[PDB]
């Protein structure tokens, strides 16, 4: 009987995919899918108390004594002859003469014109494939059911119904449009598909492909600079400039981990006590002079302001006690904006490269650099009248330096320092440009400018200027500072040590710096369904997005990063492949008499 | 009650030269006489080096593939009448790479190797009946 046979249609590859609770006992009934195989059932228990343990897989087995295995080919082109082979399987103990016949299905061509039974005798424990050749002429997919009905001697029947999907006309074509991206040449256009091989009706799936295509001094020697401040009001700064520079330089360079962690907390107390040691030398008007009785010196007040203002980010000082200190410096500004020493320092050695033919230029540059450093520590609230005159004071000071800077015929140390001071306080561009141009010409040629105290300092100040004005010049500059600083017992003086540590700290953070490297683009076009848009963010990997754009598309790539963008388009074309075998061929001719039950 | 003559040849000089494995498939109820195939193998001048026959299917391993149309034959018998008219198949698997097969067809002595289709167009219909 045709109807009695239990057609089998459920042929999944994974069915018991779920998740459920457990209470030591549950009887879940699983209906085995109508497939003949052994199933590798397994599971994982996820408990709040105990946790996970992978279960032991269970090898359930499902099998029928007499079955029919029909294995459809995956790609079945139309207008092409097809070979289907339902291999009858008979593991019974009885010789059976069964009949195989694909039920009449619309959209197909039955070789016999329909349900023509092909009686076949199957010796027990053996297979008797009954070749069936039906040419597919349907549109999308046809489900053909093979029914094996046995004789009345032992009536066991089987019926498999597997859905056959028929591919679209012709082969499939791929278009790969390799291109580039950049921050000029921003907007690009992809020409719309215009190939004449296009089948007018067919699947047109396209995909986009965007690729990001992306490309320290010794912690031992510098850590030795941490010394307990000692001496008079002058020497307390010699041991407190490197002490803050070393603490700061390793703070920015992230070299504290190399040193034992007690060292960091050992240094945070050298500065803490150091700040008190120099604070008690403060005069009534915040001069920070060498001695309480000795006359003040604007150089030290500027130098102490820079070091103390910089350290103010750590020690819980009083902002108002620092604001007054800046007031003293301003009051010493001369008519043209210069600064004159009221009392020179007892020891000229700490001055670094200041001593020389010209001093007022360097004093003006050094003080202004320090003077700005104190702007950050000013309270955001209050002192507005105090702040305002500060900008005027530096602006007046900058004008004098710019006038001197453009004049030329100045020393190397003056030339380098002037470049940084104007750069830091945002001097007028023309003065900035001429001052910067003055530095490069005066430069000398990782050969730049052992190194005496003069050359080492000026390099550090100049090196800072290049960072603020890093392209093959700062990188080639540090190679002289670091090489010059790596010598045993390097950084002889105090001004070079405090500032050289500053440049390398600044240079290191610049060189080892990373950005977002964004590259996101936009794809838009006027498709038949309307207007659609897409974007592909590539801040930090590669992306590909399925977009429905059947016409010319618009690209608006943006971002400092550069990469490769290519678009893939898929479609069908008119086939031209020969049906006849090209390399190896068979020719078989059957001659004789074949008896037929019925013939056209 | 029915004869066969399977013929195989290779163009050569492609770099894939090698043995071949015929996959001749017979009609319904056909099985080659083991006596005939056994005679092919035993001979000193042997072409079908290894053969296995069970029911319709027949494998004729060929040690040497000649460039020309030099080929072997054999006999077959039938027991159950064939209930429908159609073309059976065949296939020559390259012994070193069965993915470069060669599917071919054939049919009854008076019939053809294809079915009747009025296709020859965008519209496409067949006339088996």
């Amino acid at each position, epitope marked *: 009987d045709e109807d009695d046979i239990p057609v089998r249609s459920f042929f999944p590859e994974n069915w018991l995919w779920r998740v459920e609770t457990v209470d030591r006992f549950q009887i879940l009934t699983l209906w085995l899918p109508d497939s003949l195989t052994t199933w590798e059932i397994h599971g994982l228990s996820l408990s709040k108390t105990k946790g996970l343990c992978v279960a032991t897989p269970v090898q359930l087995r499902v099998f029928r004594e007499f079955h029919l295995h029909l294995r459809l080919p995956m790609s079945v082109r139309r207008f092409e002859q097809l070979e289907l082979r339902p291999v009858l399987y008979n593991y019974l103990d009885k010789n059976l003469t069964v009949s195989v016949h694909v039920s009449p299905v619309e959209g197909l061509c039955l070789a016999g014109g329909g349900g023509l039974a092909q009686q076949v005798l199957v010796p027990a424990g053996s297979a008797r494939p009954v070749a069936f050749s039906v040419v597919p002429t349907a549109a999308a997919a046809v489900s053909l059911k093979v029914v094996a009905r046995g004789s009345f001697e032992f009536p066991v029947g089987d019926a498999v119904s597997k859905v056959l999907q028929i591919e679209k006309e012709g082969a499939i074509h791929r278009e790969e449009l390799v291109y580039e991206l950049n921050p000029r040449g921003r907007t690009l256009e992809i020409p719309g598909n215009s190939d004449p091989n296009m089948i007018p009706d067919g699947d047109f799936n396209s995909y986009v492909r965007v690729t990001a295509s992306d490309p320290a001094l010794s912690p031992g020697g510098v850590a030795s600079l941490l010394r307990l401040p000692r001496g008079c009001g002058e020497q307390t700064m010699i041991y407190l400039a490197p002490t803050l520079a070393a603490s700061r330089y390793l703070d920015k360079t992230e070299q504290w981990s190399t040193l034992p962690p007690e060292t960091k907390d050992h240094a945070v107390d050298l500065i803490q006590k150091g700040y008190m040691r120099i604070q008690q030398f403060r005069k009534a008007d915040g001069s920070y002079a060498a001695w309480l009785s000795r006359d003040s010196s604007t150089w030290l007040t500027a130098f102490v302001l820079k070091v103390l203002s910089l350290a103010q980010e750590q020690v819980g000082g009083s902002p108002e006690k620092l604001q007054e200190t800046s007031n003293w410096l301003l009051s010493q500004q001369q008519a043209d904006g210069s600064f004159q020493d009221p009392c020179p320092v007892l020891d000229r050695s700490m001055q670094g490269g200041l001593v020389g033919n010209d001093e007022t230029v360097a004093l003006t540059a050094f003080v202004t650099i320090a003077l700005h450093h104190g702007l950050a520590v000013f309270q955001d609230e209050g002192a507005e009248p105090l702040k305002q005159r500060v900008e005027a004071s530096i602006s007046k000071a900058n004008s004098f330096l710019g006038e001197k800077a453009s004049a030329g015929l100045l020393g190397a140390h003056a030339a380098a320092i002037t470049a940084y001071a104007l750069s830091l306080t945002k001097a007028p561009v023309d003065l900035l440009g001429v001052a910067h141009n003055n530095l490069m010409a005066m430069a000398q040629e990782n050969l730049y400018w052992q190194a005496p105290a003069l050359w080492i300092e000026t390099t550090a100040y100049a090196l800072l200027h290049l960072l603020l004005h890093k392209a093959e010049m700062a990188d080639q500059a540090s190679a002289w500072l670091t090489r010059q600083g790596s010598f045993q017992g390097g950084f002889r003086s105090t001004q070079d040590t405090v500032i050289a540590l500053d440049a390398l700290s600044a240079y290191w953070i610049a060189s080892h710096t990373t950005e977002e490297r964004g590259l996101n683009v936009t794809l838009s076009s006027t498709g038949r369904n309307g207007f659609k848009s897409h974007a592909l963010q590539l801040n930090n990997l590669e992306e590909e997005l399925q977009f429905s754009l059947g016409s010319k598309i618009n690209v608006k790539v943006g971002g400092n990063s550069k990469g490769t963008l290519k678009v893939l388009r898929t479609y069908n074309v008119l086939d031209m492949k020969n049906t006849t075998c090209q390399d190896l061929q068979i020719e078989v001719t059957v001659k004789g008499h074949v008896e037929y039950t019925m013939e056209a | 009650r029915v004869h066969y003559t399977v013929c195989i040849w290779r163009n050569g000089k492609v770099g894939l030269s090698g043995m071949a494995i015929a996959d001749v498939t017979l009609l319904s109820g056909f099985h080659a006489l083991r*006596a005939d195939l056994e*005679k092919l193998t035993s001979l000193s001048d042997r072409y079908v080096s290894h053969f296995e026959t069970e029911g319709p299917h027949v494998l004729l391993y060929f040690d040497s593939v000649p460039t020309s149309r030099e080929c072997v034959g054999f*006999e077959a018998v039938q027991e159950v009448p064939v209930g429908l008219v159609q073309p059976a198949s065949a296939t020559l698997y390259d012994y070193y790479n069965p993915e470069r097969r060669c599917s071919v067809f054939y049919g009854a002595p008076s019939k053809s190797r294809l079915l009747a289709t009025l296709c020859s167009a965008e519209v496409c219909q067949c006339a088996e009946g």
Partner: nanobody, 116 residues
Framework: VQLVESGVQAGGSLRLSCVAS????MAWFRQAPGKEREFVAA????????EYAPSVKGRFTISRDNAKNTVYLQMNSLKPEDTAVYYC?????????????????WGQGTQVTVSS
């Protein structure tokens, strides 16, 4: 692998027999002077199926002996101008019905004449 053949007024009959050591499908060929040889009939190894030349449909039949492994070709109702030398030959690849001359190790044949 050698072939041996041995064995009349018009309207008579003859029974030609060719003996081959090896048991195979050897067929019959005839050659007349001045013209190229043409086949008369053939028989397969098992002898189930045989074909005859179109000129001798239903007239010449072939049989084989399973013991001495020969071919028995009876020629009842001889047709007078069929005189020719008959050759029994075979190949080792069982190409039944291979009309054209692609048989190797040809036999010698025997002369037979028919008189009206």
């Amino acid at each position: 692998v050698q072939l041996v053949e041995s064995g009349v007024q018009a309207g008579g009959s003859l029974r030609l027999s060719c003996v081959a050591s090896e048991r195979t499908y050897m067929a019959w060929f005839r050659q007349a002077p001045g013209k190229e040889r043409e086949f008369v009939a053939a028989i397969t190894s098992s002898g189930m199926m045989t074909e005859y030349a179109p000129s001798v449909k239903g007239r010449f039949t072939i049989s084989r002996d399973n013991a001495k492994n020969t071919v028995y070709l009876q020629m009842n109702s001889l047709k007078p101008e069929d005189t020719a030398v008959y050759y029994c030959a075979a190949d080792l690849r069982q190409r039944f019905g291979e009309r054209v001359t692609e048989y190797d190790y040809w036999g010698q044949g025997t002369q037979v004449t028919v008189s009206s």
